[PDB]
Amino acid sequence: FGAISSVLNDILSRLDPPEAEVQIDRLITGRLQSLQTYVTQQLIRAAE
């Protein structure tokens, strides 16, 4: 999702908190958006 790596552990290990925080923020935004999309799709499918 634009971060250096998809894995969280190597982001935490390689980079110090000041920019590792930005990388985890990008990953969190991407994963939260994916989860929102899944939940909305499931809601529509459950209504049908």
Binding site: D16, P17, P18
Partner: protein, 48 residues
């Protein structure tokens, strides 16, 4: 224009080549072994 609950005034003497080490999320001898500022620091660094 602001009101603060407390003010902390920390004083010391450092050489020029390391003045930049007094800042959030820095790497250096002073920032690691002498005096480290929090990443979410709120305040002013002053030097002359």
């Amino acid at each position: 224009d602001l009101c603060f609950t407390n003010v902390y005034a920390d004083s010391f003497v450092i050489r020029g080549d390391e003045v930049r080490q007094i800042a959030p999320g820095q790497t250096g001898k002073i920032a690691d072994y002498n005096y480290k500022l929090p990443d979410d620091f709120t305040g002013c660094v002053i030097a002359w």
